[PDB]
Design a protein around this nucleic acid. Structure first.
Ligand code: MG
Ligand code: MG
Ligand code: MG
Ligand code: MG
Ligand code: MG
Ligand code: MG
Ligand code: MG
Ligand code: MG
Ligand code: MG
Ligand code: MG
Ligand code: MG
Ligand code: MG
Ligand code: MG
Ligand code: MG
Ligand code: MG
Ligand code: MG
Ligand code: MG
Ligand code: MG
Ligand code: MG
Ligand code: MG
Ligand code: MG
Ligand code: MG
Ligand code: MG
Ligand code: MG
Ligand code: MG
Lengths: 186, 174, 165, 269, 318, 48, 288
RNA sequence: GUUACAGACUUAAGCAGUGGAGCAUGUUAUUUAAUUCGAUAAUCCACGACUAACCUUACCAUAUUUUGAAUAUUAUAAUAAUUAUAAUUAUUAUAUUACAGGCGUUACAUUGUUGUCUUUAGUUCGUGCUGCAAAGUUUUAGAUUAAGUUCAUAAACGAACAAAACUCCAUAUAUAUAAUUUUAAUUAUAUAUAAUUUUAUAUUAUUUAAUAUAAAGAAAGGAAUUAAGACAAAUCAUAAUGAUCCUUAUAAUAUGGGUAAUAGACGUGCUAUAAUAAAAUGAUAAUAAAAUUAUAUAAAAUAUAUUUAAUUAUAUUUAAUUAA
């Protein structure tokens, strides 16, 4: 009815898109635990959606088996031990796995997820770093400087058009920049 | 809420008789009045064998049944080696025995979970389902024999006060 | 009934929310900095103290906050402002976190043991005992100086009395 | 500006509602440390035409809060009958859930596309150069003591070793080296931080490699590979090694493609 | 056949017809059965958090009662708090009751209390809580205009405020007022109407799908699928619980000055069965696997001169 | 638990403006007063 | 469906346009878009989320989970009124309901529904009077179960009178209402000489009570048992003498006296018709 | 200390037991400085107590604490945080009373909760009608069901708490997801659909209802829920509170002892009294499920008991994982 609903709205209304996996280089897997479903499933869906945009090829909520912590108790405060009541608690577990991403993008995703987290859901992340066999923390000061430069590049304000800002993050950046911080090691 | 069964039966009787009027002689008015009161297939694989999964107690049996001469392999080994009790073997055979097709079909069973007798029963169940695909006309016969029924008999849990499911601890009067 | 004011997401807004343990070197430095800020009692997880309220500038992060053994009640110490606030930022902590430096203790040599005790077999036994202790203490987590003291006590280089202080 | 309530001197020229809002803000921000102001009072007096209150009365109210109001002036209306203008508890909870859902939908629509700006193509490190995989774990909201756990894991054939040295390395590894999958892994939880633990693991690996490449008066050519731990592990697990016999297959008995004429007609592309 | 297949693939709607689901306006999230909405991987930490939450609840209860120069003691009733533990942040929340444009110019005691919760820049209660949890806390009060919309509040209020009306015996007027809170709603009629509305909605969506249709299961554009479906029409009809159908309130204990014995006194109104679940696709669900979702039960036990007593309340909400 | 937790004492420290009422304490005080009145108050403690 | 930028700007605000463009860039034109059956992310109605709703979205300045504001900034400093009132129409009234002497009017309305009686007449001209107001009980297995019994004469003061009894386990007001209802259902035209007294000296037995009611000269008032008096006031009898013998059970008096009025009385005209004679009233003829 | 019918683990079959033996455990009694207190017909007796060495413990002996665990009031003094050498606050110290504290006594003062009647089918409200009325009818003449659930009949017509149903587990099917190295896809988990099963031919009794037969189906259970009332049933020893009593003691801490004493008795169990039943052995390790492992689970392997070795038990030392 002459009202152009763009593609993002359409995507929201439908199921979440998933990018295909080029190589099986499991970068990170994220397990989501909760004592119920509805929130957890929603959260997983949201994670998938954000992963799509950050192009991360996320697989999807593979349900790992639910736990069951049972506990029985005599109903009465005193005696009547023949009458007993049970209690249970189901730890519902879902798995996400990111498949191909440059670390920074993955970090951003994870940071975004934890920012807009839901009520009942706990989270655990296993990150995987394919490093070479031999390593060196000898050529140090230069490597530190490079790392600082990379950080600066990452956290640069491109256009201040009322974007999201954090005071703590700004402070951290300022600390990283400082001469005292550079001095630390030597 | 004021509708009674007897009233409904009467209504049905009235409708049915009207409907029964020979379709050629029926009217438009009658039909208008009566208008108010109206209202996946299994196949063989690439290699020509019918997969089927059966269950009993804790057991699960995925069974590949194929048209080659009748030999058995339960869980990657010989039938007499796996099932020591002859009863279990007889049970397994029974779907092929109700049909005259023991010797016709090669069977490759793969079980998991439960104990031996339950596993054998699950295999049998799977085999019947597999057979049903080869000839759908025998399905009714298999059902009659009592092989197509999934045996529901599930182990009852231990209830709190009771020792086992039903076994209660001793009662005393004095 | 109003327009949705879209504030754009940025890496800076998602800073703080970065994982505390992430492989990257850049991330590690950031995490360390965040930890140092937390130690300093910077306003993270809370609204800041500025020059508006004067009397009610209270904090709960005192030297022994959620702890019993120091005999007191809840101590409402005054917070600094955002100006006039120091950050701890210690070198040892940096070494632990950013780089992967660890102390490992020192293995006690036989010569040191010979200084105290006379017989050779006894010295060798003492050395063995010290070695055994060392690996166990490496495995355990306690405290840099305290652990070293314990190790010394176990060896016999220091007496039992130095623990009870 | 945001810092406006703090300065009562500036707001006389504003509208009355706005002035009231500023006053309320001021009262809120410094609750116990509130201290009346002349300019603020004047503003409040000016506003008085907005909400029907006399000039003396407003001033009195400003001076004395609830006591003044009481002086200026009730029946209990707790069980007054329902006028149908407010949802119950469950209802309100359901509404809140729905609000949350809507918020998340909005985020998905307009913030996640923005997030796609910060997007990089995968820069793969080759398995030839980067065989080792240090896996780190992090519990997000919590402070688990397993966050320190780091796990190195390498295929032994991917390590740059000669055949004699490789065998020696495997022998040294003992339980850490699995032989079915040619994989050697080890985890360290000894140190406080994760990075420390990773460094320690790396150092161990390096030491192991150095030992493997020694060969001076220590070969280990005549100590066969101990595979007891691996067989124990295999026993603990179950196996599905068996397969369908290949000579039992019947491709001739398989269901042939059934001729669908309308589908064929349709397929003009 | 293709069209039918496409429909089957896309056939979803709000539950409650006779391909459907219970939407977030049609049932409670089971997380809203518990009061500490949390999962942590270290269970010790989780336990510590739930202890903290419980302690904060008591503190909040204590705060809720104010004084005004020893003249008036306005006892603000509050619900049991519900603590939402996201990864980022805690959020505490509670429902509360409080009993001409002259009050634009002074802050009420209740207002001041509410301001203290989040608005006092450095000094606020949320800030102080944040030290106990190591994450940003947000207390949200929600005002209820009636006493009987929340069960806990209803029971609590009667326990605290209306002592005199039942201490010797339930006064007649008070009992009458309790009886005639709600206007005796035909719950059967309402449930049936709701079901009919749901059916109509389903038909509308189906009709739209048909219109669009005139191996891939994509229909037309969103505007044409949800042709007549809007925020003005659907949400409020779909909203499940809205109408206090039936309620029971029990006073129990030593509520008799002459008598030494106890006195169970029960007021009953409406009905506690729900007829939306009886003849439709929507099914009843059980909170903590023992309380029908629609029900909400609570009690509060104030001490008297004679000794202890309590006040059970139980509402139904269609 | 965490021994440093907010108490009613502090709710006077943090928010002096709001005249709070601890109900249980008040009740206890009233009971004590009643006991004193009807000759059932606590006996005066020995010092020695 | 990939729309142009200008078209988007026409319908959508300037803030979200960039985000839309990005979404278009990322998501291809050839897209399947599956329907997630096992979980529903989006709502059951179509909505472009550009407009924040007052009721159905979170209130902007209010604090909550998913606040997206600083710990200092929360624009909400008055908690006297409710924050999020109900959208569109203020009410949530079901179909066929309404918002809240009155009791008498309600009775009259109910009578009009049940038995087609004029409500206005019931409200105005009829005036009621309780005669007996017992509390009454039954020994049930649960226990002694009390019940409020009323007995309430109603009557237009022009010879139209009715007795009625009613009962409620709940408090006496309900019982009285029921009695009133019953009375109005049982309205009855009593005959009376000169619109002031009964015709003859009646002597009537109702169960226990033996009634004796003498006629009266005008001005001589009601000189009878209190129940009888009450009934007469409602039934328009100005002048009456009489005395109750045997039982003086209030209820039975009330029942007996109206029965006597309706039944024991004969109007002069009726008597004349029966006998075929003139039956003159001498005083009337005289003109006093 | 009454009629009459109907019901089920009531009885009857049947299978295994108790009652005899020894041991375990609870109880009794008696003993003891103390054997802490309660539960003590069904509805106590491996019950409160899902672990009594110390602790827990409440009991006893001997020691030693006296505003003590709190809250408030009134004063002196000391330290630390914040500000631009002073001050504001927060705390601590020493005291100062009101008190705090009490597993002391009364569940025959209470709360909440529980047991038994009870998953038994009962327990009541509007309007109408009957009776002067308290009341009755509804809520039953029949019958049937597991059933106040239902059809037949009826001055009744509707309506609630129970019943049933929705619920959970388990089952069958479908869809989704899992790059089939966290794999068990023979799986797990979200979302549906499915039955309190349906249809037809006959044979008995009166359009239906039981039996039988047939064809259609994976279609067959368990759990939770145990109403009103009653038993002054159980609990003041989960906890709280009324009244009452103790306040250098009936409150508080330590060291040891006791709760484990033993004539007879009473329950619950365990192990037995041998061949339709016991023991050795069984590594291409016959076949499970459910659940636990950051107050840990402890693999392989070495050493000793033990000439081979395996088994079993310890020690040595921690590989792996905080977990499909
Ligand atoms: Mg009558
Ligand atoms: Mg028997
Ligand atoms: Mg004997
Ligand atoms: Mg014996
Ligand atoms: Mg006692
Ligand atoms: Mg005893
Ligand atoms: Mg002791
Ligand atoms: Mg006391
Ligand atoms: Mg004691
Ligand atoms: Mg009790
Ligand atoms: Mg007792
Ligand atoms: Mg009856
Ligand atoms: Mg009866
Ligand atoms: Mg039921
Ligand atoms: Mg598999
Ligand atoms: Mg009962
Ligand atoms: Mg008793
Ligand atoms: Mg009792
Ligand atoms: Mg007591
Ligand atoms: Mg106590
Ligand atoms: Mg003592
Ligand atoms: Mg004992
Ligand atoms: Mg027992
Ligand atoms: Mg034997
Ligand atoms: Mg071993």
């Amino acid at each position: 009815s002459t009202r152009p609903y763009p593609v993002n709205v359409e995507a929201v209304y439908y199921a979440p898109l998933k990018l295909p996996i080029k190589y099986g280089d499991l970068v990170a897997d994220i397990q989501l635990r909760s004592y119920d479903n509805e929130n957890l499933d929603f959260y997983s869906d949201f994670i998938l959606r954000t992963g799509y945009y950050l192009g991360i090829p996320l697989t999807g909520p593979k349900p790992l088996p639910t736990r069951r912590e049972r506990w029985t108790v005599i109903k009465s405060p005193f005696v009547h031990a023949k009458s007993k009541e049970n209690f249970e608690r189901h730890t519902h577990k879902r798995l996400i796995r990111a498949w191909d991403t440059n670390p920074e993008v993955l970090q951003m995703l994870i940071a975004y997820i934890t920012k807009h987290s839901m009520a009942g859901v706990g989270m655990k992340c296993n990150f995987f770093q394919r490093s070479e066999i031999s390593l060196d923390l000898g050529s140090d000061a230069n490597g530190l400087e490079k790392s600082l430069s990379n950080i600066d590049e990452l956290y640069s304000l491109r256009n201040d058009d009322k974007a999201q800002t954090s005071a703590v993050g700004q402070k951290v950046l300022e600390l990283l920049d400082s001469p005292d911080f550079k001095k630390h090691l030597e | 809420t004021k509708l009674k069964p007897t009233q409904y039966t009467q209504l049905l009787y009235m409708l049915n008789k009207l409907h029964n009027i020979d379709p050629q002689l029926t009217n438009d008015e009658i039909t208008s009045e009566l208008s108010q009161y109206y209202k996946k297939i299994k196949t063989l694989d690439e290699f020509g064998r019918s997969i089927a999964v059966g269950k009993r107690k804790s057991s699960t049996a995925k069974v590949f049944v194929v048209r080659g001469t009748g030999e058995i392999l339960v869980n990657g080994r010989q039938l007499n080696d796996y099932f020591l009790k002859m009863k279990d073997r007889e049970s397994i055979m029974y779907p092929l025995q109700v049909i005259e097709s023991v010797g016709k079909y090669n069977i490759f069973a793969t079980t998991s979970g439960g104990g031996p007798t339950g596993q054998a029963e699950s295999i049998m169940h799977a085999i019947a389902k597999a057979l049903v695909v080869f000839n759908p006309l025998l399905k009714s016969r298999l059902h009659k024999a009592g092989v197509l029924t999934r045996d529901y008999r599930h182990v009852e849990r231990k209830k709190p006060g009771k020792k086992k499911a039903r076994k209660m601890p001793t009662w005393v009067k004095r | 009934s109003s327009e949705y004011v879209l504030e754009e997401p940025t890496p800076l807004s998602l800073l703080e929310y970065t994982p505390q343990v992430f492989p990257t070197k850049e991330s590690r430095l950031v995490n360390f900095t965040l930890d140092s800020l937390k130690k300093s009692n910077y306003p993270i997880y809370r609204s800041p103290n500025l020059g508006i309220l004067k009397v009610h500038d209270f904090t709960l992060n005192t030297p022994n906050f959620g702890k019993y053994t120091p005999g007191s009640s809840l101590i409402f110490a005054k917070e600094p402002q955002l100006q006039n606030l120091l950050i701890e930022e210690d070198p040892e902590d940096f070494h632990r976190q950013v780089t992967g430096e660890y102390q490992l203790l020192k293995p006690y040599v036989k010569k040191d043991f010979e200084k105290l005790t006379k017989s050779k077999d006894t010295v060798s036994k003492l050395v063995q005992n010290s070695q055994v202790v060392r690996l166990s203490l490496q495995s355990v987590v306690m405290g840099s100086e305290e652990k070293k003291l314990v190790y010394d006590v176990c060896s016999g280089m220091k007496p039992i009395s130095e623990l009870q202080q | 500006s945001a810092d406006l309530y703090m300065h009562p001197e500036k707001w006389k020229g504003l509208p009355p509602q706005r002035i009231l809002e500023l006053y309320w803000e001021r009262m809120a921000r410094l609750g116990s440390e509130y201290k009346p102001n002349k300019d603020e009072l004047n503003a409040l007096l000016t506003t008085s035409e907005y909400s029907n209150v006399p000039v003396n009365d407003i001033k009195k109210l400003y001076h004395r809060g609830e006591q003044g109001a009481i002086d200026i002036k009730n029946r209990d209306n707790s069980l007054r009958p329902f006028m149908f203008d407010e949802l119950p508890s469950q209802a309100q909870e359901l509404v809140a859930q729905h609000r949350e859902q809507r918020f998340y939908n909005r985020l998905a629509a307009y913030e996640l596309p923005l997030l796609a700006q910060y997007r990089q193509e995968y820069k793969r490190p080759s398995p030839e150069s980067h065989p080792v995989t240090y896996r780190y774990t992090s519990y997000v909201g919590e402070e688990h003591p397993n966050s320190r756990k780091v796990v190195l894991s390498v295929k032994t054939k991917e390590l740059g070793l000669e055949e004699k040295s490789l065998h020696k390395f495997r022998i040294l590894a003992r339980s850490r080296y699995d032989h079915t999958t040619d994989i050697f892994k080890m985890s360290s939880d000894k140190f406080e931080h994760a990075s420390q633990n990773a460094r320690y693991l790396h150092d161990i690996l390096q030491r192991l490699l150095a030992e493997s490449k020694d060969l001076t008066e220590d070969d280990f050519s005549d100590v066969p590979l101990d595979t007891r731990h691996t067989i124990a592990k295999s026993l603990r697990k179950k196996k599905r090694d068996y397969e369908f016999p290949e000579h039992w297959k019947r491709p001739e008995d398989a269901p042939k493609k059934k001729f669908d004429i309308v589908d064929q007609l349709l397929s003009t592309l | 056949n293709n069209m039918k297949r496409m429909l089957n693939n896309n056939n979803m709607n709000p539950a409650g017809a006779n391909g459907n689901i219970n939407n977030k306006l049609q049932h409670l999230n089971n997380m809203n059965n518990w009061n500490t909405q949390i999962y942590n991987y270290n269970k010790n930490m989780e336990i510590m958090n739930t202890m903290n939450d419980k302690l904060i609840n008591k503190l909040l209860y204590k705060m809720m009662t104010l004084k005004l120069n020893n003249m008036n003691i306005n006892k603000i009733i509050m619900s049991k708090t519900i603590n939402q533990h996201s990864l980022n942040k805690l959020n505490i929340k509670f429902y509360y009751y409080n009993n001409n444009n002259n009050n634009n110019y002074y802050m009420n005691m209740m207002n001041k209390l509410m301001n203290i919760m989040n608005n006092n820049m450095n000094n606020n209660l949320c800030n102080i809580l944040s030290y106990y949890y190591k994450k940003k806390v947000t207390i949200e009060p929600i005002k209820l205009s009636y006493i009987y919309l929340n069960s806990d509040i209803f029971s609590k209020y009667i326990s605290l405020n209306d002592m005199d009306k039942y201490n010797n015996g339930i006064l007649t007027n008070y009992q009458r007022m309790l009886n005639n809170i709600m206007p005796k709603l035909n719950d059967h009629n309402i449930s049936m109407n709701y079901i009919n509305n749901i059916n109509n909605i389903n038909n509308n969506k189906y009709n739209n799908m048909i219109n669009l249709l005139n191996n891939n299961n994509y229909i037309g554009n969103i505007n044409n699928i949800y042709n007549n479906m809007t925020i003005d029409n659907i949400p409020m009809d779909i909203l499940m619980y809205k109408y206090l159908v039936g309620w029971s309130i029990k006073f129990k204990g030593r509520l008799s000055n002459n008598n030494g014995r106890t006195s169970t006194t029960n007021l009953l109104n409406g009905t506690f069965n729900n007829k939306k679940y009886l003849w439709s696709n929507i099914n009843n669900n059980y909170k903590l696997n023992y309380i029908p979702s629609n029900h909400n039960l609570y009690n509060n036990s104030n001490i008297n001169k004679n000794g202890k007593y309590n006040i059970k309340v139980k509402l139904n909400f269609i | 638990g965490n021994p440093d937790i907010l108490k009613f004492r502090h709710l006077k420290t943090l928010y002096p403006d709001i005249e709070f009422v601890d109900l249980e304490e008040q009740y206890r005080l009233s009971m004590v007063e009643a006991k004193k009145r009807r000759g059932k108050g606590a006996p005066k403690k020995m010092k020695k | 469906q990939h729309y142009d930028e200008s078209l988007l700007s026409r319908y959508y605000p300037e803030s979200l346009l960039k985000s839309i463009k990005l979404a278009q860039q990322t998501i291809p034109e050839d897209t399947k878009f599956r329907v997630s059956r096992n979980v529903e992310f989006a709502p059951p109605y179509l909505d472009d989320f550009t407009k924040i709703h007052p009721f159905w979205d979170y209130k902007p300045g209010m604090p909550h989970l998913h606040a997206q504001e600083e710990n200092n900034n929360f624009s909400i400093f008055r908690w006297d009124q409710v924050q999020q009132p109900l959208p569109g129409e203020g009410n949530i009234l079901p179909p066929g309901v309404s918002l809240p002497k009155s009791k008498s009017a309600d009775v009259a309305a109910g009578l009009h529904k049940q038995t087609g009686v004029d409500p206005d007449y019931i409200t105005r001209k009829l005036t009621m009077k309780p005669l007996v107001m017992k509390r009454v009980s039954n020994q049930t297995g649960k226990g002694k179960i009390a019940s409020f019994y009323a007995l309430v004469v109603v009557g237009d003061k022009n010879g139209m009178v009715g007795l009625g009894e009613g009962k409620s386990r709940e408090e006496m007001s309900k019982a009285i209402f029921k009695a009133h209802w019953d009375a109005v259902r049982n309205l009855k035209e009593i005959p009376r000489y000169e619109n002031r007294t009964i015709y003859g000296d009646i002597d009537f037995r109702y169960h226990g009570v033996k009634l004796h009611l003498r006629s009266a000269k005008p001005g001589f008032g009601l000189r009878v048992n209190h129940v009888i008096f009450e009934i007469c006031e409602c039934a328009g009898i100005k002048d009456l003498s009489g005395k109750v013998y045997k039982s003086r059970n209030d209820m039975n008096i009330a029942k007996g006296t109206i029965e006597a009025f309706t039944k024991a009385q004969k109007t002069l005209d009726e008597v004349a018709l029966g006998r075929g004679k003139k039956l003159v009233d001498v005083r009337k003829v005289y003109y006093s």
